[PDB]
C-alpha cells in the first residue's frame, strides 16, 4: 500500500503535451478524470482539490485499497472523487466518458487478455478530445532487467539475499574484467542502489514483463488509437547522435520508426505514453507563435546579483547555476541573453509566459528591441524546453511564491502533514505540491506545514516551533555539539529555521496564499 | 543452396577425446555407429566415415532435397559407409537402432518445445551404455541481444541481406564517441555482426525463428530423461579462475557443477552451448590427474623467433619468446633451459600430437642434462592450465594425417573432392575445406589449384609447373605481372609454402 503522486499523471501536464503539440484537450476545470489501478487514489486528490468542480472516479481491484483511500478521502474532505472496485474487465460504459484517462504501471502486469481491454476501454470510455496514459515498460530494456531477475531469484532456493548476490557480481565482475562486464556491474551496481521496497515490487515481486513500443502503438492502432507522445520530453529528443545519422533519422516523416530506433540505442526501460482518438491532427510542427503563450520555468541561481554588476557593458562571462549542481551552465557575454537569465531566477518557480519572460527582459535591459529578445528565445531556448531543462505550463499552477502574512497551503498537504508516511535512510515525510510532486520534509517542516491554514500568523508558528523545542518533541542544536539551545538564542534560532522552511514552501509550489 | 559445414567438435574422436578426459571409457571407434539429427547435406559424417571404414553413420533430416543432395555428394565422394534418409525426429526408435555416438546440432533450439524434449527421450533411448550424445542450442542470457539486433532489422527490412548491411552501418554511426554508458556493448555486437558472413548472417538472423534457453532448462530437462551431464566440446569454456580469487574459491566450495556454470551463463554473457551427455549409471570424475593427461596426444602449435642452431639453450641470462600459430604477437619467454627444451620440441611437432611423457622424452633428449622426471615436472608445473586454457590440444588418439612432406602429396579423398565445389566466404576470404580434424580450414583459389592436384601421382615439380602454367593463362595472376626467371623463383615460394600450410593444418594424409 505505497501511496504516490505522480506530477506526470497530473491532467494539467497531460493537458500542456496536448496542447503543445497542436491538440485541443478538454477544459481543466470541469473536467473528468479516470484512474485505472488507483489503489488508495491519492494521485486523483490533488487535481480534485485544484479543481471542486472537476468529478473524479478511481477505479481497482484490491477492495481493502479501494476502502483505505475511501477513509482517506473522507479524512481529508473530499467530495470530487468516488472509488469502486471494480475488474477492468467489468469496465465498460453507463457512467460516462471521461476527459482525461490514466492507466499507471497496471499495464504490464497483467494477462493479455486485459492487456488488450485495456486498449479496448481507452477507447470507448475516452472522449474525443481527451488524453489517455498508459504506463508500461519497454524493450530491450527489459531483457537486462529481467535477467538480473532471474539471476537473484535463481539464487534463491529473502530481500537480504539479492542484495548479497548483486554484491558477489560487483566482485566476480572486479576490475578484472572489460567487455560486456562494464555494462553489468554498471547496471546491477544501479539495481542495488534503490530502496527496499522498490527492488521488493519490481524484481522480487509479482510478475510483469516488457514490450515494444511498436508492438504496444500498433496494438493501439488497431483499437483506433494514435500517439501523442511522452510524459518525458527529453525522452524523444533526438541528438546527442551525431548530425550526418540524425539528419537521416529527422529526414524521414515516422514517429514509430523514431521513436523505436531510438529505444534501441539507448535501452529503454519503461515508457509513459499518450494517446489520443485517430480522427485528430497532431502538430509535430514546433512553431514559436504558439510557444509564447506556454509559461516557463528556469531553476537558475545567480552567482553575482543584479545591484553589484551592471551588465549593460557585454564584457564579462557570468555562470549562474543550474539547480546547484556547482559547475553552472553556458553564459554570456551578449546582454540580451543575460536579462531573460536573471527574469527567470526572479522568477524561480514562479512560472511566467515565454512573451512575458522576453517583455521583463526588455525592461530590465531596456537598451534593445522586444522583438530582437524574442529573436534570442526562438533561437534558443526550445533546445532547453526539449532537453527537460525549462519546463512549461498553459496554465499557470494554482499556488504563489510570495510569502503571505498567514501562509496557507492545499488542504490534500495540510493532511499529508499529519498522516504523512515517514521513511528513514533520510528522515522526510512526502508531501505534494500542487503540481501532483512528492515532496522531502524535515520532521521540523512537517510541524510547519499543518500550521499554514491561513489562520495563523508568522508569530504564531515561531512561537509554537519553540513551543516543541523546549517541550521536545523537537531538539535543537547549537554547533558546539550536544547544546539543546537554550533561551532567546532560541527565539533567534527558530526565525532563521521557520524563514528558511518558509521559503522552501514558496519555490517549491507549496504555497497556495 | 545451403552452407555444406563440418565441424571440429562433433567430431566423434573429439567426442571420445573428452569422455576419456572426464574417466570415462567410450566407446571403440574403428567400429563405431554414429547418428546424426538434422544432418542436411550430411557432410559432418563423411570427413569420419572416409577416415573409419569398418564404422557406419545414418543421417537423418526432415528436408527431402537436402537428403537427395546428401546422397549425390556421397555417390561422387565414393563413400559407402553413411546412409541418408528424412524422418520426422518422432518416428525415431525403429531397426535404426543403438548407435555409439550421437550429434544433434543446430536443431534443437529450432524446433518446437514437443519435438525439444522429444529429442533427448529419443537420445536416451538410442544410446549404448557408454556411448556419448552432443547437442547445442543457444542459451540465455546471451541470447537476448542477438535477438534484438535480429529483431531490429526484421523490423527494418519490412518497409534482405542488403539493407541490413545499411541496418548495421547505420548503427555503429548512431553511436559517436560521446555517445558511452552500455552503448559500447551494442556498438560491440552490432560491429561483431558486421564480420561472419553471408550465410551465417542469413540463416540465423533473418531466416530464424530460433529460440533461446537456459542450461539449467536443458541439464535439467535431460536429468528428466535419463541423461546426465558430461561436459562442453569448448574445454576453455569449463574452465573458470580468470575472475578473481574470493569469489573463485566461493564459487568453488559449493561444488554443485549445474550453479557454477549457469552462474559463469549470467557474467560471461554466453550465446551458445554444445553439450555432451552420457547415462547417468557412469561416474563421472571431473578430478584431472596429470598421470591421466599424460596419456593423451598433445599439441602446442608454436614458431621460434630465433631458430634452435644459432642459439645456445643453456645460457639462463638470454630471453627467447616464440609465437602461438601466428598471432603476430610474441607469446611465451625463458630464461629456464629445461622449459627451452620442451618449447622447441612442441615447435617442431607443431601440428603433430604427440604424448606427453614422450614430449619429455625428446626434450630430454634435445638437452640431456636432468632426469627425465625434472622435464615431466616442469609439465606438471606450468604446461597444464594451458590445456584448459584452450592453447594446448589434447587427442588419444592420434589422427590419421601428417607432418611430414611426402614428395607425392597426398590429400584426403573427401578434401580432393571438396575442392571442386567446396564453399567460397566471399565476404571476402577463401573457400572452406575439411581437414582430418573435420575443422574448416581458410584455402584461397592458388592453393586450391594445388590441392585439388595431390593425390599422391604428382611430385611437387609437377605441382610448380602446373601453377606457373596457370599464371600466364590467368586465372592466377601474381602482382608486383613478371618474367619467367622471377616467375619460377615466386612459385617456388608460394608452392613451399602452401604445402607447409597444409602440412600443418593435417591436410596431409600421406
Ligand atoms: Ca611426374
Ligand atoms: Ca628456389
Given at each position: 500500500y505505497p501511496p504516490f503522486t505522480f506530477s506526470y499523471t497530473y491532467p494539467p501536464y497531460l493537458r500542456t503535451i496536448g496542447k503543445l503539440f497542436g491538440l485541443n484537450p478538454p477544459?481543466?476545470?470541469?473536467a473528468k478524470v479516470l484512474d485505472i489501478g488507483?489503489?488508495?487514489?491519492?494521485?486523483?486528490?490533488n487535481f480534485a482539490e485544484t479543481y471542486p468542480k472537476s468529478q473524479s472516479l478511481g477505479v481497482d481491484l484490491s477492495k481493502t485499497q479501494i476502502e483505505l483511500g475511501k477513509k482517506t478521502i473522507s479524512d481529508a474532505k473530499i467530495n470530487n472523487v468516488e472509488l469502486k472496485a471494480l475488474s477492468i474487465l467489468d469496465?465498460?460504459?453507463?457512467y460516462g466518458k471521461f476527459d482525461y484517462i490514466v492507466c499507471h504501471g497496471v499495464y504490464s502486469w497483467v494477462s493479455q487478455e486485459v492487456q488488450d481491454k485495456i486498449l479496448e476501454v481507452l477507447n470507448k470510455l475516452l472522449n474525443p478530445n481527451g488524453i489517455a496514459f498508459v504506463s508500461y515498460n519497454t524493450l530491450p530494456g527489459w531483457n537486462m532487467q529481467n535477467t538480473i531477475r532471474e539471476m537473484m531469484m535463481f539464487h534463491s532456493?529473502?530481500?537480504?539475499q539479492a542484495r548479497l548476490l548483486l554484491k558477489f557480481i560487483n566482485d566476480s565482475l572486479?576490475?578484472?574484467?572489460?567487455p560486456y562486464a562494464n555494462f553489468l556491474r554498471d547496471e546491477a551496481k544501479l539495481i542495488s542502489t534503490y530502496d527496499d521496497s522498490y527492488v521488493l515490487h519490481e524484481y522480487l515481486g509479482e510478475i510483469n514483463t516488457g514490450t515494444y513500443f511498436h508492438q504496444f502503438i500498433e496494438k493501439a492502432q488497431k483499437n483506433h488509437l494514435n500517439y501523442l507522445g511522452?510524459?518525458?520530453?527529453?525522452?524523444?529528443?533526438?541528438?546527442?547522435?551525431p548530425t550526418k545519422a540524425a539528419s537521416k533519422l529527422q529526414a524521414i516523416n515516422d514517429i514509430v520508426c523514431t521513436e523505436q530506433y531510438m529505444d534501441f540505442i539507448?535501452?529503454?526501460?519503461f515508457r509513459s505514453t499518450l494517446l489520443c482518438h485517430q480522427n485528430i491532427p497532431i502538430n509535430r510542427k514546433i512553431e514559436f507563435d504558439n510557444l509564447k503563450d506556454f509559461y516557463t520555468t528556469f531553476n537558475i541561481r545567480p552567482i553575482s546579483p543584479e545591484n553589484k554588476i551592471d551588465?549593460?557593458?557585454?564584457q564579462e562571462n557570468i555562470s549562474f547555476y543550474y539547480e546547484n549542481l556547482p559547475e553552472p551552465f553556458i553564459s554570456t557575454t551578449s546582454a540580451i541573453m543575460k536579462a531573460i537569465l536573471y527574469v527567470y531566477a526572479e522568477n524561480i518557480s514562479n512560472p511566467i509566459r515565454l512573451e512575458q519572460v522576453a517583455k521583463e527582459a526588455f525592461k530590465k535591459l531596456?537598451?534593445?528591441r522586444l522583438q530582437d529578445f524574442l529573436a534570442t528565445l526562438e533561437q534558443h531556448f526550445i533546445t532547453l524546453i526539449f532537453q527537460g531543462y525549462l519546463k512549461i505550463f498553459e496554465?499557470?499552477?494554482?499556488?504563489?511564491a510570495t510569502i503571505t502574512e498567514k501562509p496557507k497551503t492545499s488542504q490534500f498537504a495540510r493532511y499529508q502533514a499529519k498522516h504523512a508516511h515517514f521513511n528513514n535512510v533520510t528522515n522526510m515525510f512526502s508531501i505534494t505540491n500542487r503540481l501532483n510532486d512528492m515532496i522531502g520534509i524535515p520532521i521540523h517542516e512537517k510541524y510547519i506545514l499543518e500550521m499554514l491554514?491561513?489562520?495563523?500568523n508568522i508569530d504564531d508558528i515561531k512561537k509554537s516551533i519553540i513551543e516543541k523545542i523546549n517541550s521536545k518533541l523537537l531538539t535543537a542544536c547549537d554547533?558546539?555539539?550536544?547544546?539543546?539551545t537554550d533561551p532567546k538564542l532560541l527565539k533567534e534560532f527558530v526565525d532563521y529555521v521557520v524563514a528558511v522552511s518558509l521559503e522552501k514552501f514558496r519555490i517549491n509550489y507549496l504555497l497556495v496564499g
Open positions: 477544459l481543466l476545470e470541469t488507483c489503489g488508495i487514489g491519492v494521485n486523483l486528490l469496465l465498460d460504459e453507463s532456493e529473502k530481500l537480504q572486479g576490475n578484472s574484467t572489460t511522452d510524459t518525458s520530453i527529453a525522452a524523444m529528443f533526438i541528438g546527442n547522435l539507448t535501452n529503454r526501460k551588465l549593460n557593458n557585454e531596456g537598451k534593445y496554465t499557470k499552477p494554482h499556488a504563489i491554514d491561513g489562520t495563523h554547533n558546539k555539539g550536544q547544546v539543546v
